[PDB]
Amino acid sequence: LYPDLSEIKKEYNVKEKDQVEDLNLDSLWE
């Protein structure tokens, strides 16, 4: 329940992932 209580930690926690998953599900598909 409630927010992620992060939403600027999460996005910070995701931006780092939203920048790598590619190189795993896009870097080896290239």
Swiss-Prot record:
This is p9. A motif (LYPX(n)L motif) lies at residues 1-5. The chain holds residues 457 to 486 of 486 of the full protein. Signal peptide: none annotated. Coiled coil: none annotated. Interacts with human PDCD6IP/AIP1. It comes from Equine infectious anemia virus (strain Wyoming) (EIAV).
